[PDB]
C-alpha cells in the first residue's frame, strides 16, 4: 500500500520555475529516502539525486547542480524538487521514487511514483484542423482521418462513437512546423462503407474542439 | 562518478526463449546493482537488486549475476508480459542508470496491407496537401517505405509514425504522411507509396491519379 501520488502534465514557458511534488502514503515517511528521476522523450532514465526527509540531507548528480533542489515537508508527507531557470532541454518525465530501507549514503529505490510530464515551449493552445482519408477504389476498406496541426497533446479519436472498434488504429502523433499531427483508421468490410455512415469523432480537449467527421467519397 | 554501459539498445525474443542484457560499470560496483522494468504510461518495477537478489513477488525466470565491474540480466521461458524496457542502475556511489535495453517478440512474419489517401476537398482549400499512406499488420518494424511522384522518388517532406507492437498478434503499424503545397500537390497526377520488406521480393505498390 505504498503510494506516490504526483501531479498530471504541466505546461511552461522557457525561463519558467517548477516546483514538484510527491505526496507518500502507506509507510512511515522518515524512515525512506526519496530520490527524483528525470526521463526525456524516447531516452533512458536519469538520476538526479535523493533526500533524508528525517534531517533534508541531500547528494546529488552533479549535472543537475543550480537546477534541482530537493526538499521535504515532514507534516504532510510531502516530497519536493524544484527545478530552475527551465530551457526545452528540461521538458521530460519526473519520477519520485521510494529508497529501499537502508542507512547508507547511496541505494536503490523501490516503489516509483506514475511520474510529472513537464513541457517547457512558447507554442499555444492551437485547434486541429480534421480531415477525412477516403480511398480511391476489394473486401476489406481502410479508411482514416488525419488530425493536423494541434497544441498541446493529447487528442482522442473514436469512431461512430465508439461502435466500431475492432481494426482501429491510432497513430502517435508526431511534430510538423512545431504542432502536433496524427492520423488514425479503421478497416471495415467493403459490404458496410460506403453503404452505411463512418464518422471520425475527434476530441481536443485542451481547445474544446469536438468534430465529428463523415467520411465520404472524394470529389 | 561511475559509468554503466548496458547492452544491448534492443533485442527480439522469442516466446519461451532466452534474454540476456548485460552492464559494465567504469570502476567495481561490489554488486551494488540493481535491475528495473518499465512499460508505456506506468512507473518502473524494481526486478533485482545486489546482482541477484528477487523481490518478493518477481517471477522466478528473471535472475542476475555478476561481481567486480560486470553484470548481466536474464529472463528465461520469456513470456508475453515480460516484452518491456529494462534499465540497470549502480548505487555503490551516486547513482547512475544504464541507457536502457527494449525487448520486442519475434513473431511469424507479415506483409503490411497499404492503403494511399489523396488530400481531402477540405484540406484544398487551405493551400496545403497532404498524402497519406497506412501500412497495417506487419513484421518485422524493419520496412522501407518510398514515395514515387510522376515517377520519381520522393524523399523529403514525409513523416513516419510507428505504433507499438501489439499486444494481440506481435505484429506492427505505420503511417507515412507526404505533406505539400496544394499547387505542388496539382502539377503532378501519379501519387504512389511502396514498401519493401522481408515478406515480398518486389515492392508492395499503392497508387492514385489525381484527375481519376
Known amino acids: 500500500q505504498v503510494q506516490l501520488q504526483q501531479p498530471g502534465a504541466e505546461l511552461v514557458m522557457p525561463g519558467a520555475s517548477v516546483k514538484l511534488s510527491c505526496k507518500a502514503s502507506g509507510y512511515t515517511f522518515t524512515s525512506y529516502w526519496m530520490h527524483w528521476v528525470k526521463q526525456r522523450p524516447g531516452e533512458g532514465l536519469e538520476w538526479i539525486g535523493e533526500?533524508?526527509?528525517?534531517?533534508?540531507?541531500?547528494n546529488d548528480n552533479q549535472k543537475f547542480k543550480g537546477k534541482a533542489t530537493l526538499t521535504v515537508d515532514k507534516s504532510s508527507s510531502t516530497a519536493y524538487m524544484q527545478l530552475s531557470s527551465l530551457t526545452s532541454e528540461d521538458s521530460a518525465v519526473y519520477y519520485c521514487?521510494?529508497?529501499?530501507?537502508?542507512?547508507?549514503?547511496?541505494?536503490?529505490?523501490?516503489?516509483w511514483g506514475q511520474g510529472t510530464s513537464v513541457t517547457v515551449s512558447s507554442a499555444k493552445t492551437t485547434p486541429p484542423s480534421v480531415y477525412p482519408l477516403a480511398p480511391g477504389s476489394n473486401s476489406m476498406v481502410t479508411l482514416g482521418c488525419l488530425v493536423k496541426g494541434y497544441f498541446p497533446e493529447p487528442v482522442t479519436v473514436t469512431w461512430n462513437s465508439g461502435s466500431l472498434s475492432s481494426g482501429v488504429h491510432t497513430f502517435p502523433a508526431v511534430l510538423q512546423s512545431d504542432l502536433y499531427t496524427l492520423s488514425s483508421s479503421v478497416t471495415v468490410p467493403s459490404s458496410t462503407w460506403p453503404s452505411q455512415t463512418v464518422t471520425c469523432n475527434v476530441a481536443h480537449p485542451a481547445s474544446s474542439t469536438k468534430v465529428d467527421k463523415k467520411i465520404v467519397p472524394r470529389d | 562518478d561511475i559509468q554503466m554501459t548496458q547492452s544491448p539498445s534492443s533485442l527480439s525474443a522469442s516466446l519461451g526463449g532466452k534474454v540476456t542484457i548485460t552492464c559494465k560499470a567504469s570502476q567495481d560496483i561490489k554488486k551494488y546493482i540493481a535491475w528495473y522494468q518499465h512499460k508505456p504510461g506506468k512507473g518502473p518495477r524494481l526486478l533485482i537488486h545486489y546482482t541477484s537478489t528477487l523481490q518478493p513477488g518477481i517471477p522466478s525466470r528473471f535472475s542476475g549475476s555478476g561481481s567486480g565491474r560486470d553484470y548481466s540480466f536474464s529472463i528465461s521461458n520469456l513470456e508475453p508480459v515480460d516484452i518491456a524496457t529494462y534499465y540497470c542502475?549502480?548505487?555503490?556511489?551516486?547513482?547512475?542508470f544504464g541507457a536502457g535495453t527494449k525487448l520486442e517478440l519475434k513473431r511469424a512474419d507479415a506483409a503490411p496491407t497499404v492503403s494511399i489517401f489523396p488530400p481531402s476537398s477540405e484540406q484544398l482549400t487551405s493551400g496545403g496537401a497532404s498524402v497519406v499512406c497506412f501500412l497495417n499488420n506487419f513484421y518485422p518494424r524493419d520496412i522501407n517505405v518510398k514515395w514515387k511522384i510522376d515517377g520519381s522518388e520522393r524523399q523529403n517532406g514525409v513523416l513516419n509514425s510507428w505504433t507499438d507492437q501489439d499486444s494481440k498478434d506481435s505484429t506492427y503499424n505505420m503511417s507515412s504522411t507526404l505533406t505539400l503545397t496544394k499547387d505542388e500537390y496539382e502539377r503532378h497526377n501519379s501519387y504512389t507509396c511502396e514498401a519493401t520488406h522481408k515478406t515480398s521480393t518486389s515492392p508492395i505498390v499503392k497508387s492514385f491519379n489525381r484527375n481519376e
Open positions: 542502475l549502480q548505487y555503490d556511489n551516486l547513482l547512475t
Open positions: 533526500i533524508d526527509p528525517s534531517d533534508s540531507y541531500t
Open positions: 521514487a521510494r529508497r529501499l530501507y537502508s542507512n547508507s549514503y547511496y541505494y536503490a529505490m523501490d516503489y
